[model samples]
Target: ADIQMTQSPSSLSASVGDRVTITCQASQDIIKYLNWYQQTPGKAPKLLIYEASNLQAGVPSRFSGSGSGTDYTFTISSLQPEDIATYYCQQYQSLPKTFGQGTKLQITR
Candidate 1:
């Protein structure tokens, strides 16, 4: 079956209060079907963005997303103590939703 795909940075380093951007590229145009999520150590992934760039309610304003068709981005304007985790990009546009390789955001110091 056809499935959506996303490419993401393997790992990144940042600091508290720092702004970070994570990008994910899909194999085809996902349009508003693109979604972004954050994962904790042993918990499920948290939905952050949907329909490409729309932020989910209850999520902080500092967390944002943008892009179009095949290219998408997720940005965190300010790093928080609870922000340390793995991020993933996905496409809910079709059956068998697919996810990216996963991006691990860590503190540099």
Candidate 2:
């Protein structure tokens, strides 16, 4: 498995109303097999976006994703208190799925 996911801003600090963005770059062309997840302190990771840019059921509209080929982007229209968590991007185009290093998001007053 030579494919790898690289995420930027390993950590971030933002305000409640600020717009936040995370980026992920795949080592190779995986088409639209990318997915995004959010993980809080003590809970399992929850799926936010799948198959490139499709929002998961029940997810808020504020959260959106888009990208193709080897680049991807995830954005939060307006950060909220509950948005403090680590975000991860995963690729399922090949066996043994791979996930990004993760971007830990924190809130600032």
Candidate 3:
């Protein structure tokens, strides 16, 4: 069966320098085969976290991810103006790769 990713806080508003967190749950156990991505308006999606908790190359240290089995977490130690974007969680353990609905993040003054 295909694994479904459910992401929380479909939309969020936070001030710069504040901490932000996002969660993702899988319909079925996906171990550590999950990945997180960030997509800026009109730009291609960029990988932020891979294999559930491994930070991707060139990504900022402020961004981190963790979890296993069916639950996963993504966090930003400090939100920034340029961090405004849509974030998504994807499962790669099965065919027809699935993604979460995406969480829209906005930075407030």
Candidate 4:
């Protein structure tokens, strides 16, 4: 149950144009199935990762994922107004899905 990840750092006081990315690794294989999440403001974190390269049940197509086995990528095609939040990576390939610490997406304007 060891999950490692990479993330970006941002400030909530940031402006309205911030970009960020997060990476993660699993001790074992996750079958390319991972989950990404975003959290900010006054709402619960949203799931933005799934099926290695598939978006979760409810997520914008702007976000995309690709990779398998041990590496993966969760990217936001373009920074959007509502996409101003921290993004994280996770994998459900294992029994218990692990979540990356987090990548804070801050804006600076």
Q: lDDT tens digits, residues 1-109, model 1?
A: 6665655678988989999998888777777788888999999879999987899988899999998888888999999989999999888777778989889999896
TM-score each candidate: 0.91, 0.96, 0.96, 0.74
The Cα error of candidate 2 at residue 45, in Å, is 0.9
Clashes of each: 0, 0, 0, 6
Give the Cα lDDT of each candidate. 0.86, 0.93, 0.93, 0.66
Q: What pairs collide in candidate 1? A: none
Better TM-score candidate (1, 4): 1
lDDT (10s digit) by residue, model 4, range 1-109:
5555544342343444333344566666767777777887688977776676777767877788777887777677667777777777776766565766676665555
Candidate 3 per-residue lDDT over residues 1-109, each given as its tens digit: 6778999989999998999999999999888999999999898999999999999888999999999999999999998888989999999988789999999998654
TM-score of 1: 0.91
The ten-residue window of minimal lDDT in model 4 covers 8-17
- Tell me the spans in candidate 3 whose CA falls farther than 4 Å from its real position: none
**Candidate 2 lDDT by residue in tens digits, 22-81:** 999999998999999999988888999998899988889999999999999999999988
Give the residue spans of candidate 4 off by over 4 A: 6-20
Error of 2 at 43 (Å): 0.8
lDDT pick, better of 1 and 4 = 1
Query: Per-residue error at 27 for model 4, in Å?
Result: 2.8
